[PDB]
């Protein structure tokens, strides 16, 4: 995962990182619990 690792470990803020680092996306988010990083 990119910072997603369910609600033990909730790095919203590395996948939003991580989405910002990529060219096109504005940030990123952890949803499905927290198990998903999607970047928006």
Same mark, same amino acid.
């Given at each position: 995962?990119?910072g997603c690792? @369910?609600?033990?470990?909730?790095?919203?803020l590395?996948?939003?990182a991580? *989405?910002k680092?990529?060219? @096109?996306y504005?940030?990123?988010?952890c949803a499905?619990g927290?198990?998903? *990083?999607?970047?928006?």
């Amino acid at each position: 995962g990119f910072g997603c690792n @369910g609600p033990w470990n909730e790095d919203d803020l590395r996948c939003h990182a991580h *989405c910002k680092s990529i060219k @096109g996306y504005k940030g990123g988010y952890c949803a499905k619990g927290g198990f998903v *990083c999607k970047c928006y």
